[PDB]
Structure 1
Amino acid sequence: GLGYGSWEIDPKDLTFLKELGTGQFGVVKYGKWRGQYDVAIKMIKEGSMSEDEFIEEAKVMMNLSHEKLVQLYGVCTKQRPIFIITEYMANGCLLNYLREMRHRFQTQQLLEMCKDVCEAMEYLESKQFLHRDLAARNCLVNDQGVVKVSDFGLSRYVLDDEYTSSVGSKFPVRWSPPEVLMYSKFSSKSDIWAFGVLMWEIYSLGKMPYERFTNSETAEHIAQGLRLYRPHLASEKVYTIMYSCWHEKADERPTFKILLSNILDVMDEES
């Protein structure tokens, strides 16, 4: 209504129900919008985000719509902290989900998780939109076990420089290709590399990539042409797909469309 643009939600329409956790931007809550609709409410800690730049970009993010992307519903920005309102995902963060051994996942389930993410990424790629921090910790799981990609592009608005370059102590070194670590060259192909590492995370049931190495040691390892190796649960065909994401030459890495076709082929052959 009056006083709100299409990207703006009236915070008075929110009912807060439960705290979900605390991330780098602060607290996230579960609630309802207009008494009925489940939402996640991210309360952005003062000084953590380039808020004006994010708000302008939220207008673009609003129009990203794909079943395997966690939907942005709008922002509450008349205030502080500002809120980001998104789709609620009842089963939480993929990294934590993978690590719960009770699930006793079949490999077909793991491949489906990879396909969920690959469909989201193929969509983003078709819109020339980079994730820039793809990893299991940025995927969420709904009450039907569907995995969706979250926080696409959001790293661009982080003000804490520990996160923002390879010079930083919290940069995602373990999900970065050599050209990012060496030269800060981000591209579709750095998302492709990260996706291969995510596949590895899924098939490893949430192990940290390069688990015995520091970030520094990982960067060395990678730049010397060495790689993660095959998780026990990955068939040779699945390993070929994730490994293809790690070509030293970025242009020799597949597209998300090609990865999706490869994943579908393996599903058909392994079903």
Structure 2
Amino acid sequence: GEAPNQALLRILKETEFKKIKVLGSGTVYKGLWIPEGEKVKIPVAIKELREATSPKANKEILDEAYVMASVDNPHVCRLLGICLTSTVQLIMQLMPFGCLLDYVREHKDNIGSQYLLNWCVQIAKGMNYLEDRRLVHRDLAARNVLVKTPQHVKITDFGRAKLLGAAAAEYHAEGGKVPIKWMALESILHRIYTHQSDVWSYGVTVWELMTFGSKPYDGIPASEISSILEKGERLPQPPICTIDVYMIMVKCWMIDADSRPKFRELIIEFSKMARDPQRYLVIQGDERMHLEDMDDVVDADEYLIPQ
């Protein structure tokens, strides 16, 4: 016996929610959700499948739904329920400032050390929680973290997430479109994936944030990456980064998976640094930087149903 998964999957009527506008094209809407028979309005993102004629695509979105229903943490994405219309709709908490990669590209000039290190802690907390839940994300990247507020981010995209069995050390994949430049060496060579492969990608995610959304190994093709890593080459020290911050990124990219840090240790190291941010990141102008009815609106984070 593993522990039973008593996550609740909530089925919503299409009449419970109003699509307000498009955010993306699968097509994502900003909208509002009124839970049946409750006087509350919840800002949501409603992901509606396009063709909805593809049995493959329907297995995909429901796998996402399975994983997102089974996680409850402040630093991971919050599913509110699904709607089984012609086109299946996922309803999640609206994350109004979009993905963190776009956010740090758009706002390079306004982002101070305190925000960057707090983001590093929050993502470390999200990933430590997933580890507690024996869940390997397999696609952590700056693009797959969302911004509820500039003070508050959550890990997203559980489309590749795999739920390690009671006796299963690694997860074993076979083909697809894969993020080579974020992947542990053991993942590119032997399709091996663990919490420790997730630490490698946390390292690349941190490097994306510390370079204000630069592309890892830009101009180096996917075919070369495994060879570069075997030859011991790693991503360069970002300009803002003290050796303290960069040495943490470097340890996440050790070839011995068990030599990399644990998510619980990254939480600790980034917290120590977050208490004195200007000791650990050096940024030009750091001290200066600052980042009908709405009556019954509540954020999804204050909308709890019984457990």
Can you list the C-alpha shifts for 1:159-201, whole angstroms capped at 9, x where unaligned?
xxxxx97854x31000001100000001111111100000000
In structure 2, the residue matched to 1:174 is: 181
Instruction: Note closer, same or farther for the CA distance 1:225–1:115 as it changes in structure 2 (3 Å cut).
Output: same
Q: Report the alpha carbon displacement of residue 74 of structure 1 after superposing the two structures with TM.
A: 1.3
Instruction: Give runs of aligned pairs for residues 202-221 of structure 1, distance below 5 A.
Output: 202-221=209-228
1: distance between equivalents of 2:273 and 2:56?
Answer: 41
2: distance between equivalents of 1:218 and 1:166?
Answer: 19
Matched to 1:74, the amino acid is G
Unaligned runs of 5+ in 2: 1-7, 35-39, 163-171, 279-307
Unaligned runs of 5+ in 1: 158-163
In structure 1, the residue matched to 2:117 is: 111
Q: Is the 8 A contact 2:77 2:156 kept in 1?
A: yes
- TM-score norm. by structure 1 comes to 0.86
Q: CA RMSD in A?
A: 2.4
In structure 2, the residue matched to 1:251 is: 258
Q: Report the alpha carbon displacement of residue 225 of structure 1 after superposing the two structures with TM.
A: 2.2
1:222 is the counterpart of 2:233 = no
Can you list the C-alpha shifts for 1:129-155, whole angstroms capped at 9, x where unaligned?
111100011111123442211123x12
2: distance between equivalents of 1:62 and 1:79?
Answer: 19
1: distance between equivalents of 2:265 and 2:114?
Answer: 19
Instruction: Note closer, same or farther for the CA distance 1:193–1:103 as it changes in structure 2 (3 Å cut).
Output: same
1:37 is the counterpart of 2:35 = no
Q: Is the 8 A contact 2:65 2:90 kept in 1?
A: no
2: distance between equivalents of 1:250 and 1:185?
Answer: 11
Matched to 2:42, the amino acid is Y
Instruction: Note closer, same or farther for the CA distance 1:256–1:21 as it changes in structure 2 (3 Å cut).
Output: same
Q: Report the alpha carbon displacement of residue 116 of structure 1 after superposing the two structures with TM.
A: 1.4
In structure 2, the residue matched to 1:161 is: none
In structure 1, the residue matched to 2:286 is: none
In structure 1, the residue matched to 2:99 is: 93
Equivalent pairs, count: 255
Q: Is the 8 A contact 1:174 1:210 kept in 2?
A: yes
1:241 is matched with which residue: 240, 244, 248?
Answer: 248
Q: Is the 8 A contact 2:19 2:32 kept in 1?
A: yes
Q: Is the 8 A contact 1:31 1:41 kept in 2?
A: yes
Q: Is the 8 A contact 1:40 1:87 kept in 2?
A: yes
1: distance between equivalents of 2:271 and 2:45?
Answer: 31
Q: Is the 8 A contact 1:165 1:171 kept in 2?
A: no
Instruction: Give runs of aligned pairs for residues 18-167 of structure 1, distance below 5 A.
Output: 18-22=21-25, 26-34=26-34, 36-45=41-50, 46=52, 47=54, 49-52=56-59, 55=62, 58-76=65-83, 78-101=84-107, 103-152=109-158, 154-155=159-160
Q: Is the 8 A contact 2:17 2:31 kept in 1?
A: yes
Instruction: Note closer, same or farther for the CA distance 1:148–1:48 as it changes in structure 2 (3 Å cut).
Output: farther
Q: Report the alpha carbon displacement of residue 250 of structure 1 after superposing the two structures with TM.
A: 0.8
Rg larger in 1 or in 2?
Answer: 2
* Higher RCO structure, 1 or 2 (CA under 8 Å, sep 6+): 2
- TM-score norm. by structure 2 comes to 0.76
Q: Is the 8 A contact 1:166 1:181 kept in 2?
A: no
SS in 2 for 1:209: coil
SS in 2 for 1:181: helix
1: distance between equivalents of 2:106 and 2:203?
Answer: 22
In structure 2, the residue matched to 1:17 is: 20
1: distance between equivalents of 2:120 and 2:161?
Answer: 25
SS in 2 for 1:73: strand
Matched to 1:137, the amino acid is R
SS in 2 for 1:155: coil
Q: Is the 8 A contact 2:145 2:153 kept in 1?
A: yes
1: distance between equivalents of 2:215 and 2:264?
Answer: 27
Identity within the alignment, %: 33
Q: Is the 8 A contact 2:115 2:151 kept in 1?
A: no
